[PDB]
Design a protein around this nucleic acid. Structure first.
Ligand SMILES: *[C@@H]1O[C@H](CO)[C@@H](O[C@@H]2O[C@H](CO)[C@@H](O[C@@H]3O[C@H](CO[C@H]4O[C@H](CO)[C@@H](O)[C@H](O)[C@@H]4O[C@@H]4O[C@H](CO)[C@@H](O[C@@H]5O[C@H](CO[C@]6(C(=O)O)C[C@H](O)[C@@H](NC(C)=O)[C@H]([C@H](O)[C@H](O)CO)O6)[C@H](O)[C@H](O)[C@H]5O)[C@H](O)[C@H]4NC(C)=O)[C@@H](O)[C@H](O[C@H]4O[C@H](CO)[C@@H](O)[C@H](O)[C@@H]4O)[C@@H]3O)[C@H](O)[C@H]2NC(C)=O)[C@H](O)[C@H]1NC(C)=O
Ligand SMILES: *C[C@@](*)(O)[C@H](CCCNC(N)=[NH2+])NC(=O)[C@@H]1CCCN1C(=O)[C@H](N)Cc1ccccc1
Ligand code: NA
Ligand code: NA
Lengths: 259, 31
DNA sequence: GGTCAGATGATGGGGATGGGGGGTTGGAGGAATGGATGAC
Protein backbone atom coordinates (compact mmCIF):
# COMPACT_ATOMS: atom_id res chain seq x y z
CA UNK A 1 0.00 0.00 0.00
CA UNK A 2 1.39 3.37 -1.10
CA UNK A 3 0.50 6.47 0.96
CA UNK A 4 -1.45 4.30 3.39
CA UNK A 5 -1.43 4.22 7.20
CA UNK A 6 -0.96 1.60 9.92
CA UNK A 7 -4.04 -0.58 10.54
CA UNK A 8 -5.73 -0.48 13.95
CA UNK A 9 -5.64 -3.82 15.79
CA UNK A 10 -8.43 -5.87 14.19
CA UNK A 11 -9.92 -3.32 11.77
CA UNK A 12 -9.57 -5.95 9.01
CA UNK A 13 -10.13 -9.38 10.68
CA UNK A 14 -10.80 -10.97 7.28
CA UNK A 15 -7.30 -10.02 6.12
CA UNK A 16 -5.52 -13.21 5.11
CA UNK A 17 -1.81 -13.43 4.27
CA UNK A 18 -0.75 -15.92 1.60
CA UNK A 19 2.70 -17.34 2.29
CA UNK A 20 5.22 -19.55 0.46
CA UNK A 21 6.37 -22.53 2.54
CA UNK A 22 9.91 -22.80 1.16
CA UNK A 23 11.56 -20.46 0.75
CA UNK A 24 9.50 -18.60 3.35
CA UNK A 25 8.18 -15.56 1.48
CA UNK A 26 5.02 -13.46 1.61
CA UNK A 27 3.30 -13.73 -1.78
CA UNK A 28 -0.08 -12.01 -1.67
CA UNK A 29 -3.14 -11.02 0.31
CA UNK A 30 -6.49 -12.74 0.67
CA UNK A 31 -9.83 -12.40 2.42
CA UNK A 32 -11.73 -14.75 4.71
CA UNK A 33 -15.30 -15.19 3.46
CA UNK A 34 -16.18 -18.23 5.58
CA UNK A 35 -14.62 -20.43 8.27
CA UNK A 36 -13.35 -22.78 5.56
CA UNK A 37 -13.02 -20.47 2.54
CA UNK A 38 -10.48 -17.84 1.44
CA UNK A 39 -10.62 -15.56 -1.59
CA UNK A 40 -7.65 -14.21 -3.57
CA UNK A 41 -6.46 -13.03 -6.98
CA UNK A 42 -5.76 -15.80 -9.51
CA UNK A 43 -2.34 -14.37 -10.47
CA UNK A 44 -0.94 -15.05 -6.99
CA UNK A 45 -1.36 -18.75 -7.77
CA UNK A 46 -1.12 -18.97 -11.55
CA UNK A 47 0.75 -16.59 -13.82
CA UNK A 48 2.62 -18.60 -16.54
CA UNK A 49 4.34 -15.50 -18.10
CA UNK A 50 6.36 -15.36 -14.85
CA UNK A 51 6.68 -19.15 -14.51
CA UNK A 52 4.36 -18.99 -11.47
CA UNK A 53 2.07 -21.98 -10.84
CA UNK A 54 1.60 -23.10 -7.23
CA UNK A 55 -0.02 -26.08 -5.43
CA UNK A 56 -1.98 -26.53 -2.17
CA UNK A 57 1.06 -27.92 -0.33
CA UNK A 58 3.32 -25.15 -1.70
CA UNK A 59 1.52 -22.46 0.30
CA UNK A 60 0.43 -21.58 3.84
CA UNK A 61 -2.33 -19.20 4.96
CA UNK A 62 -1.81 -16.94 7.98
CA UNK A 63 -4.90 -15.35 9.51
CA UNK A 64 -5.40 -12.66 12.17
CA UNK A 65 -2.06 -10.94 11.59
CA UNK A 66 -0.86 -7.38 12.17
CA UNK A 67 2.94 -7.58 12.23
CA UNK A 68 4.15 -8.42 8.73
CA UNK A 69 6.57 -11.31 9.23
CA UNK A 70 7.07 -12.43 12.82
CA UNK A 71 4.85 -15.13 14.32
CA UNK A 72 2.26 -13.36 16.48
CA UNK A 73 1.94 -15.91 19.29
CA UNK A 74 -1.59 -16.56 20.62
CA UNK A 75 -3.11 -14.40 17.84
CA UNK A 76 -2.47 -15.79 14.37
CA UNK A 77 -3.81 -19.05 13.01
CA UNK A 78 -1.92 -20.77 10.20
CA UNK A 79 -4.06 -22.99 7.98
CA UNK A 80 -3.10 -25.34 5.17
CA UNK A 81 -4.87 -25.65 1.81
CA UNK A 82 -7.16 -28.54 0.95
CA UNK A 83 -7.95 -27.31 -2.57
CA UNK A 84 -7.27 -24.31 -4.85
CA UNK A 85 -9.96 -23.27 -7.34
CA UNK A 86 -9.10 -20.80 -10.12
CA UNK A 87 -11.83 -19.24 -12.25
CA UNK A 88 -11.78 -21.39 -15.44
CA UNK A 89 -12.07 -18.26 -17.57
CA UNK A 90 -9.23 -16.40 -15.86
CA UNK A 91 -7.24 -14.88 -18.71
CA UNK A 92 -3.55 -14.69 -17.81
CA UNK A 93 -2.54 -14.35 -21.47
CA UNK A 94 -3.91 -10.85 -21.83
CA UNK A 95 -5.30 -8.63 -19.07
CA UNK A 96 -5.87 -10.71 -15.92
CA UNK A 97 -9.59 -10.78 -16.68
CA UNK A 98 -11.39 -12.67 -13.89
CA UNK A 99 -8.42 -12.48 -11.51
CA UNK A 100 -10.12 -14.62 -8.88
CA UNK A 101 -9.41 -17.80 -6.95
CA UNK A 102 -10.93 -19.61 -3.99
CA UNK A 103 -8.99 -21.57 -1.42
CA UNK A 104 -10.47 -24.23 0.84
CA UNK A 105 -8.83 -24.75 4.23
CA UNK A 106 -8.30 -28.29 5.54
CA UNK A 107 -9.80 -27.39 8.93
CA UNK A 108 -12.24 -24.52 9.62
CA UNK A 109 -10.60 -21.66 11.50
CA UNK A 110 -11.69 -20.57 14.98
CA UNK A 111 -12.98 -16.98 14.86
CA UNK A 112 -11.66 -14.42 17.37
CA UNK A 113 -11.18 -10.66 17.86
CA UNK A 114 -8.58 -10.80 15.10
CA UNK A 115 -10.22 -13.38 12.81
CA UNK A 116 -13.69 -12.78 11.33
CA UNK A 117 -15.05 -13.18 7.74
CA UNK A 118 -16.23 -10.40 5.40
CA UNK A 119 -19.56 -10.43 3.55
CA UNK A 120 -19.94 -11.05 -0.14
CA UNK A 121 -22.40 -8.51 -1.66
CA UNK A 122 -25.80 -9.27 -3.22
CA UNK A 123 -27.31 -7.64 -6.32
CA UNK A 124 -28.71 -4.69 -4.36
CA UNK A 125 -25.63 -3.98 -2.21
CA UNK A 126 -23.53 -3.94 -5.39
CA UNK A 127 -25.94 -1.58 -7.20
CA UNK A 128 -26.21 0.54 -4.06
CA UNK A 129 -22.51 0.84 -3.22
CA UNK A 130 -20.54 0.55 -6.47
CA UNK A 131 -20.84 4.14 -7.68
CA UNK A 132 -18.24 6.60 -8.96
CA UNK A 133 -17.06 8.73 -6.02
CA UNK A 134 -17.98 6.25 -3.28
CA UNK A 135 -14.96 5.36 -1.16
CA UNK A 136 -13.87 1.80 -0.44
CA UNK A 137 -10.89 0.52 1.53
CA UNK A 138 -7.81 -1.49 0.48
CA UNK A 139 -5.32 -3.22 2.79
CA UNK A 140 -2.11 -5.27 2.58
CA UNK A 141 1.57 -5.77 3.40
CA UNK A 142 2.60 -4.92 -0.17
CA UNK A 143 5.17 -2.33 -1.22
CA UNK A 144 5.28 1.26 0.07
CA UNK A 145 6.88 2.43 -3.21
CA UNK A 146 7.92 1.20 -6.65
CA UNK A 147 10.83 -0.99 -5.59
CA UNK A 148 11.87 -2.06 -9.09
CA UNK A 149 13.29 1.42 -9.55
CA UNK A 150 15.84 3.27 -7.42
CA UNK A 151 13.99 5.07 -4.62
CA UNK A 152 14.31 5.94 -0.93
CA UNK A 153 12.15 5.04 2.05
CA UNK A 154 11.55 1.42 3.14
CA UNK A 155 10.33 -1.22 0.68
CA UNK A 156 7.79 -3.13 2.81
CA UNK A 157 5.82 -2.03 5.94
CA UNK A 158 6.16 -3.74 9.32
CA UNK A 159 2.40 -3.79 10.03
CA UNK A 160 -0.76 -4.06 7.89
CA UNK A 161 -1.45 -0.96 5.78
CA UNK A 162 -4.82 0.69 5.12
CA UNK A 163 -5.92 3.30 2.61
CA UNK A 164 -9.41 4.43 1.54
CA UNK A 165 -9.91 5.25 -2.16
CA UNK A 166 -12.84 6.45 -4.36
CA UNK A 167 -14.26 4.35 -7.19
CA UNK A 168 -13.73 5.95 -10.60
CA UNK A 169 -16.11 6.20 -13.57
CA UNK A 170 -15.52 3.50 -16.19
CA UNK A 171 -14.81 6.16 -18.92
CA UNK A 172 -11.84 7.36 -16.83
CA UNK A 173 -10.46 3.87 -16.08
CA UNK A 174 -10.91 2.95 -19.76
CA UNK A 175 -8.41 5.50 -20.99
CA UNK A 176 -6.02 5.90 -18.04
CA UNK A 177 -4.39 2.75 -19.45
CA UNK A 178 -3.81 1.07 -22.81
CA UNK A 179 -4.67 -2.32 -21.31
CA UNK A 180 -8.15 -3.52 -22.26
CA UNK A 181 -10.50 -3.14 -19.29
CA UNK A 182 -13.42 -5.49 -18.58
CA UNK A 183 -16.79 -5.42 -16.82
CA UNK A 184 -15.17 -7.97 -14.47
CA UNK A 185 -12.91 -5.23 -13.01
CA UNK A 186 -13.22 -1.73 -11.55
CA UNK A 187 -10.61 0.97 -10.97
CA UNK A 188 -10.21 3.12 -7.85
CA UNK A 189 -8.08 5.97 -6.48
CA UNK A 190 -7.93 9.79 -6.43
CA UNK A 191 -7.70 11.80 -9.65
CA UNK A 192 -4.65 14.12 -9.94
CA UNK A 193 -6.45 17.40 -9.19
CA UNK A 194 -8.21 15.84 -6.16
CA UNK A 195 -4.93 16.43 -4.29
CA UNK A 196 -4.88 13.15 -2.35
CA UNK A 197 -2.78 10.04 -2.86
CA UNK A 198 -3.01 6.28 -2.41
CA UNK A 199 -2.79 2.90 -4.12
CA UNK A 200 -2.32 -0.81 -3.78
CA UNK A 201 1.19 -1.78 -4.87
CA UNK A 202 2.89 -5.08 -5.68
CA UNK A 203 2.33 -7.69 -2.95
CA UNK A 204 -1.15 -6.35 -2.15
CA UNK A 205 -2.93 -8.58 -4.70
CA UNK A 206 -5.77 -10.74 -3.40
CA UNK A 207 -6.31 -8.07 -0.73
CA UNK A 208 -9.98 -7.01 -0.28
CA UNK A 209 -11.52 -3.79 -1.53
CA UNK A 210 -14.21 -3.52 1.13
CA UNK A 211 -17.04 -1.05 1.68
CA UNK A 212 -19.31 -0.53 4.68
CA UNK A 213 -23.07 -0.42 4.04
CA UNK A 214 -24.82 2.44 5.96
CA UNK A 215 -28.02 0.35 6.02
CA UNK A 216 -27.13 -2.92 7.80
CA UNK A 217 -23.78 -1.58 9.06
CA UNK A 218 -21.84 -4.57 7.65
CA UNK A 219 -18.56 -4.65 5.72
CA UNK A 220 -18.74 -6.08 2.21
CA UNK A 221 -15.92 -7.18 -0.06
CA UNK A 222 -16.52 -5.48 -3.42
CA UNK A 223 -13.14 -6.01 -5.06
CA UNK A 224 -9.89 -7.98 -5.09
CA UNK A 225 -6.59 -6.12 -5.60
CA UNK A 226 -5.77 -7.20 -9.14
CA UNK A 227 -3.38 -4.98 -11.13
CA UNK A 228 -1.96 -1.49 -11.75
CA UNK A 229 0.80 0.35 -13.63
CA UNK A 230 3.43 1.60 -11.26
CA UNK A 231 2.20 2.64 -7.81
CA UNK A 232 0.48 5.93 -7.01
CA UNK A 233 1.37 7.52 -10.35
CA UNK A 234 -0.70 10.55 -11.42
CA UNK A 235 -3.49 9.69 -13.86
CA UNK A 236 -3.04 6.02 -12.92
CA UNK A 237 -5.74 4.05 -11.08
CA UNK A 238 -5.66 0.74 -9.20
CA UNK A 239 -7.67 -2.08 -10.81
CA UNK A 240 -9.75 -4.52 -8.78
CA UNK A 241 -11.55 -7.76 -9.62
CA UNK A 242 -15.32 -7.16 -9.55
CA UNK A 243 -16.46 -9.57 -6.82
CA UNK A 244 -20.19 -9.25 -7.48
CA UNK A 245 -19.93 -9.85 -11.24
CA UNK A 246 -18.32 -13.15 -10.24
CA UNK A 247 -20.58 -14.16 -7.32
CA UNK A 248 -22.41 -16.82 -9.36
CA UNK A 249 -19.11 -18.71 -9.77
CA UNK A 250 -18.11 -18.09 -6.14
CA UNK A 251 -21.43 -19.43 -4.82
CA UNK A 252 -21.19 -22.37 -7.23
CA UNK A 253 -17.91 -23.61 -5.72
CA UNK A 254 -18.55 -22.67 -2.05
CA UNK A 255 -21.89 -24.50 -1.94
CA UNK A 256 -20.90 -27.35 -4.25
CA UNK A 257 -20.27 -29.89 -1.49
CA UNK A 258 -21.93 -30.55 1.86
CA UNK A 259 -19.61 -29.24 4.57
CA UNK B 1 -19.46 -22.15 8.12
CA UNK B 2 -20.40 -19.05 10.14
CA UNK B 3 -21.46 -16.71 7.30
CA UNK B 4 -24.54 -15.27 9.00
CA UNK B 5 -22.50 -12.89 11.15
CA UNK B 6 -20.02 -11.69 8.51
CA UNK B 7 -18.95 -8.07 8.04
CA UNK B 8 -19.26 -7.28 11.75
CA UNK B 9 -15.97 -6.69 13.54
CA UNK B 10 -15.55 -8.06 17.11
CA UNK B 11 -13.59 -4.95 18.10
CA UNK B 12 -15.69 -2.41 16.21
CA UNK B 13 -19.35 -3.02 15.28
CA UNK B 14 -19.80 -5.60 18.07
CA UNK B 15 -18.78 -2.85 20.53
CA UNK B 16 -20.35 0.16 18.79
CA UNK B 17 -16.87 1.64 18.25
CA UNK B 18 -15.66 3.18 14.97
CA UNK B 19 -12.22 3.01 13.34
CA UNK B 20 -10.32 6.27 12.98
CA UNK B 21 -11.12 6.70 9.26
CA UNK B 22 -14.48 4.91 9.01
CA UNK B 23 -16.70 8.02 8.69
CA UNK B 24 -14.64 9.00 5.63
CA UNK B 25 -16.33 6.16 3.72
CA UNK B 26 -19.83 6.90 5.05
CA UNK B 27 -19.43 10.58 4.07
CA UNK B 28 -18.42 9.47 0.57
CA UNK B 29 -21.90 7.93 0.17
CA UNK B 30 -23.63 11.33 0.58
CA UNK B 31 -23.57 11.93 -3.20
C1' DG C 1 57.27 -16.00 5.54
C1' DG C 2 52.73 -16.32 4.42
C1' DT C 3 49.12 -20.22 3.29
C1' DC C 4 46.14 -23.32 6.29
C1' DA C 5 42.65 -25.42 9.45
C1' DG C 6 40.67 -26.67 13.44
C1' DA C 7 39.67 -24.06 17.32
C1' DT C 8 38.55 -21.67 21.39
C1' DG C 9 35.98 -16.92 21.82
C1' DA C 10 33.68 -13.10 23.82
C1' DT C 11 29.37 -10.87 22.12
C1' DG C 12 25.39 -10.18 21.00
C1' DG C 13 22.70 -13.39 21.13
C1' DG C 14 14.58 -16.99 21.34
C1' DG C 15 11.04 -19.01 19.80
C1' DA C 16 6.93 -20.95 13.52
C1' DT C 17 9.04 -14.49 16.05
C1' DG C 18 11.67 -8.02 16.86
C1' DG C 19 13.09 -5.44 19.94
C1' DG C 20 12.69 -6.08 23.97
C1' DG C 21 10.84 -6.97 29.48
C1' DG C 22 4.50 -5.87 26.94
C1' DG C 23 2.20 -5.98 22.62
C1' DT C 24 -2.87 -7.66 19.29
C1' DT C 25 0.30 -12.77 23.37
C1' DG C 26 4.28 -15.76 28.10
C1' DG C 27 8.12 -16.09 30.20
C1' DA C 28 12.59 -17.34 29.83
C1' DG C 29 17.00 -18.75 27.02
C1' DG C 30 19.65 -16.74 23.27
C1' DA C 31 22.85 -16.35 16.15
C1' DA C 32 26.55 -17.42 13.73
C1' DT C 33 30.99 -15.96 12.38
C1' DG C 34 36.07 -13.46 13.48
C1' DG C 35 41.77 -13.17 12.64
C1' DA C 36 45.10 -14.71 16.00
C1' DT C 37 47.80 -19.25 16.25
C1' DG C 38 50.94 -23.50 15.66
C1' DA C 39 52.27 -26.86 11.72
C1' DC C 40 54.84 -26.47 7.11
C1 LIG D 1 0.24 -25.66 -13.66
O1 LIG D 1 0.85 -26.83 -13.14
C2 LIG D 1 0.08 -28.04 -13.26
C3 LIG D 1 0.92 -29.14 -12.65
O2 LIG D 1 1.29 -28.83 -11.31
C4 LIG D 1 -0.24 -28.30 -14.73
O3 LIG D 1 -1.13 -29.41 -14.85
C5 LIG D 1 -0.40 -30.64 -15.00
O4 LIG D 1 0.16 -30.87 -16.30
C6 LIG D 1 -0.64 -31.66 -17.21
C7 LIG D 1 -1.84 -30.83 -17.63
O5 LIG D 1 -1.70 -30.41 -18.98
C8 LIG D 1 -1.01 -33.04 -16.66
O6 LIG D 1 -0.15 -34.00 -17.26
C9 LIG D 1 -0.89 -35.16 -17.70
O7 LIG D 1 -1.22 -36.03 -16.61
C10 LIG D 1 -2.01 -37.16 -16.99
C11 LIG D 1 -2.40 -37.86 -15.70
O8 LIG D 1 -2.89 -36.91 -14.74
C12 LIG D 1 -3.29 -37.49 -13.47
O9 LIG D 1 -2.16 -38.06 -12.77
C13 LIG D 1 -2.20 -38.19 -11.30
C14 LIG D 1 -2.97 -39.45 -10.94
O10 LIG D 1 -2.74 -40.50 -11.89
C15 LIG D 1 -2.75 -36.93 -10.60
O11 LIG D 1 -1.80 -36.46 -9.65
C16 LIG D 1 -3.07 -35.85 -11.62
O12 LIG D 1 -3.66 -34.72 -10.97
C17 LIG D 1 -4.00 -36.40 -12.67
O13 LIG D 1 -5.20 -36.90 -12.06
C18 LIG D 1 -6.42 -36.35 -12.62
O14 LIG D 1 -6.50 -34.94 -12.64
C19 LIG D 1 -7.75 -34.49 -13.20
C20 LIG D 1 -7.57 -33.05 -13.64
O15 LIG D 1 -7.34 -32.20 -12.52
C21 LIG D 1 -8.85 -34.69 -12.16
O16 LIG D 1 -10.12 -34.60 -12.81
C22 LIG D 1 -11.11 -33.93 -11.98
O17 LIG D 1 -11.95 -34.94 -11.41
C23 LIG D 1 -13.00 -34.43 -10.57
C24 LIG D 1 -13.65 -35.62 -9.91
O18 LIG D 1 -12.70 -36.68 -9.70
C25 LIG D 1 -12.57 -38.10 -9.81
C26 LIG D 1 -13.93 -38.59 -9.30
O19 LIG D 1 -14.73 -39.07 -10.07
O20 LIG D 1 -14.20 -38.48 -8.12
C27 LIG D 1 -11.45 -38.43 -8.85
C28 LIG D 1 -11.28 -39.93 -8.75
O21 LIG D 1 -10.14 -40.22 -7.93
C29 LIG D 1 -11.13 -40.58 -10.13
N1 LIG D 1 -11.24 -42.03 -9.98
C30 LIG D 1 -10.31 -42.79 -9.40
C31 LIG D 1 -10.74 -43.55 -8.18
O22 LIG D 1 -9.16 -42.87 -9.84
C32 LIG D 1 -12.18 -40.08 -11.14
C33 LIG D 1 -11.82 -40.44 -12.58
O23 LIG D 1 -10.66 -39.72 -12.99
C34 LIG D 1 -12.92 -40.19 -13.61
O24 LIG D 1 -14.07 -39.61 -12.99
C35 LIG D 1 -13.33 -41.44 -14.37
O25 LIG D 1 -13.17 -41.26 -15.78
O26 LIG D 1 -12.26 -38.64 -11.11
C36 LIG D 1 -13.95 -33.60 -11.42
O27 LIG D 1 -14.47 -34.39 -12.48
C37 LIG D 1 -13.19 -32.41 -11.99
O28 LIG D 1 -14.03 -31.65 -12.85
C38 LIG D 1 -11.93 -32.87 -12.74
O29 LIG D 1 -11.13 -31.72 -13.01
C39 LIG D 1 -8.68 -36.03 -11.42
O30 LIG D 1 -8.39 -35.82 -10.04
C40 LIG D 1 -7.68 -37.02 -12.03
N2 LIG D 1 -8.36 -37.97 -12.89
C41 LIG D 1 -8.25 -38.07 -14.22
C42 LIG D 1 -9.35 -37.44 -15.02
O31 LIG D 1 -7.31 -38.66 -14.76
C43 LIG D 1 -1.20 -38.03 -17.96
O32 LIG D 1 -2.03 -39.09 -18.43
C44 LIG D 1 -0.70 -37.22 -19.16
O33 LIG D 1 0.26 -37.95 -19.92
C45 LIG D 1 -0.12 -38.32 -21.28
O34 LIG D 1 -1.05 -39.43 -21.31
C46 LIG D 1 -2.03 -39.39 -22.37
C47 LIG D 1 -2.65 -40.77 -22.43
O35 LIG D 1 -1.68 -41.76 -22.77
C48 LIG D 1 -1.36 -38.97 -23.67
O36 LIG D 1 -2.26 -39.15 -24.76
C49 LIG D 1 -0.93 -37.51 -23.58
O37 LIG D 1 0.18 -37.26 -24.45
C50 LIG D 1 -0.57 -37.12 -22.14
O38 LIG D 1 0.42 -36.10 -22.09
C51 LIG D 1 -0.05 -35.91 -18.72
O39 LIG D 1 1.25 -36.16 -18.18
C52 LIG D 1 -0.85 -33.08 -15.14
O40 LIG D 1 -1.60 -34.15 -14.57
C53 LIG D 1 -1.31 -31.77 -14.52
N3 LIG D 1 -1.45 -31.85 -13.08
C54 LIG D 1 -2.59 -31.49 -12.49
C55 LIG D 1 -2.52 -31.24 -11.01
O41 LIG D 1 -3.63 -31.37 -13.12
C56 LIG D 1 -0.92 -27.08 -15.35
O42 LIG D 1 -1.20 -27.30 -16.72
C57 LIG D 1 -0.06 -25.84 -15.15
N4 LIG D 1 -0.63 -24.67 -15.80
C58 LIG D 1 0.04 -23.97 -16.72
C59 LIG D 1 -0.72 -23.57 -17.95
O43 LIG D 1 1.23 -23.67 -16.57
C1 LIG E 1 -0.29 -9.65 -7.94
C2 LIG E 1 -0.43 -8.31 -7.26
O1 LIG E 1 0.43 -8.26 -6.11
C3 LIG E 1 -0.12 -7.12 -8.18
C4 LIG E 1 -0.77 -5.83 -7.70
C5 LIG E 1 -0.54 -4.64 -8.62
C6 LIG E 1 -1.36 -3.50 -8.06
N1 LIG E 1 -0.86 -2.20 -8.48
C7 LIG E 1 -1.55 -1.07 -8.32
N2 LIG E 1 -1.01 0.08 -8.67
N3 LIG E 1 -2.76 -1.11 -7.80
N4 LIG E 1 -0.48 -7.37 -9.59
C8 LIG E 1 0.42 -7.33 -10.57
O2 LIG E 1 1.59 -6.97 -10.41
C9 LIG E 1 -0.06 -7.80 -11.94
C10 LIG E 1 0.30 -9.27 -12.18
C11 LIG E 1 1.48 -9.25 -13.13
C12 LIG E 1 1.27 -8.02 -13.97
N5 LIG E 1 0.61 -7.09 -13.03
C13 LIG E 1 0.54 -5.76 -13.11
O3 LIG E 1 -0.27 -5.11 -12.46
C14 LIG E 1 1.46 -5.03 -14.08
N6 LIG E 1 2.26 -4.04 -13.30
C15 LIG E 1 0.61 -4.49 -15.26
C16 LIG E 1 -0.08 -5.58 -16.03
C17 LIG E 1 0.65 -6.50 -16.77
C18 LIG E 1 0.02 -7.52 -17.47
C19 LIG E 1 -1.36 -7.62 -17.45
C20 LIG E 1 -2.10 -6.72 -16.71
C21 LIG E 1 -1.46 -5.71 -16.01
NA1 NA F 1 -2.77 7.32 -8.80
NA1 NA G 1 8.73 -11.48 22.84
Amino acid sequence: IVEGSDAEIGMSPWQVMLFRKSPQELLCGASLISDRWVLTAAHCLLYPPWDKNFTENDLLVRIGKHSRTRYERNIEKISMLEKIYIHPRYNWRENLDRDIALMKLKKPVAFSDYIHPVCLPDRETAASLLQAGYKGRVTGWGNLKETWTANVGKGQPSVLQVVNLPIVERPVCKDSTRIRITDNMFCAGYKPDEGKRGDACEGDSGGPFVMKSPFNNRWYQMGIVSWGEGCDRDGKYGFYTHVFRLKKWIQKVIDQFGE
Amino acid sequence: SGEADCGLRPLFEKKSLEDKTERELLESYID
